[PDB]
Amino acid sequence: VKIVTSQAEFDSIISQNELVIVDFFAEWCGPCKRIAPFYEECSKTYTKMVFIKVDVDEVSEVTEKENITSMPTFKVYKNGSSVDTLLGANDSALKQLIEKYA
Amino acid sequence: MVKIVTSQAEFDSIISQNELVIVDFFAEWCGPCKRIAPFYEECSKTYTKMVFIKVDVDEVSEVTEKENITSMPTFKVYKNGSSVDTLLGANDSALKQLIEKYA
């Protein structure tokens, strides 16, 4: 699962893929680490969607622009725009979000 | 997509008609078991080399007593009809590791 290291790379991936999900994680956040393996797993089966990760401190610029309050946050983008957004680390909840779009 | 096994005969059959079987010993009274269910179902979709089954410890008492299941949940893997590895607890990272060890 691609970890995005810059604004440019974020803006680029989101703009030239019709379906992208982004997992806003951080190494200081336990729940994020908990759900990572499940996220990795889904990215394997739900091939209609591009899976990326963004470390909220690593790319501050993107977190402040995407307005992230709690941790983790999963946002999906369709055609370059924010469409759905889920807060927290629950497996079934995240499954339900992904299936909504693939 | 993950068979719930409802009898010892069926348990025995699957274990013996299949090269690799992983089994998730769950129960409806066990919170942890319910949490890890979606990950297990997901894994079954991708790690196709291996047959995933669930067994409810109380529904199939005879099996849980024979397989000597103490903690909940328990995942066992079987290669060629014999118990080969067993993981206790509901940890996504750990369960992945166990499955990856065989597919």
Cα–Cα distances in angstroms (integers) from residue B85 to residues A55, B28, B101, in the given order: 35, 24, 10
Per the entry, the structure determination technique was X-ray
CB atoms A91 and B35 under 8 Å? yes
B92 contacts in chain A (CB < 8 Å) = 34-35, 37-38, 91
**Rounded Cα gap, residues A7 and B45, in angstroms:** 34
Question: Which string of DSSP letters, residue by residue, matches B15-80?
Answer: HHH-SEEEEEEE-TT-HHHHHHHHHHHHHHHH-TTSEEEEEETTTTHHHHHHTT--SSSEEEEEET
List the CATH code of the domain at A1-102.
Answer: 3.40.30.10
**Rounded Cα gap, residues A97 and A90, in angstroms:** 11
Sign of CA dihedral A58, A62, A64, A68: negative
Domain layout of chain A by residue ranges: 1-102
Q: How far is B78 from chain A (nearest CA, A)?
A: 22
**Rounded Cα gap, residues A74 and A46, in angstroms:** 15
**Rounded Cα gap, residues B20 and B91, in angstroms:** 21
CB B64 within 8 A of CB B55: yes
CATH class of B1-103: alpha beta
**Rounded Cα gap, residues B95 and B40, in angstroms:** 8
CB B7 within 8 A of CB B63: no
CB B45 within 8 A of CB A45: yes
Closest by Cα among B91, B88, B67 to B78: B67
**Rounded Cα gap, residues B1 and B6, in angstroms:** 15
CB B64 within 8 A of CB B33: no
Backbone angles phi, psi at A88, to 5 degrees: 95, 170
Beta bridge partners of residue A53, listed in sequence order = A3, A23
- How many Å separate Cα B95 from the centre of its chain? 10
B93 contacts in chain A (CB < 8 Å) = 36-37
Q: How far is B42 from chain A (nearest CA, A)?
A: 7
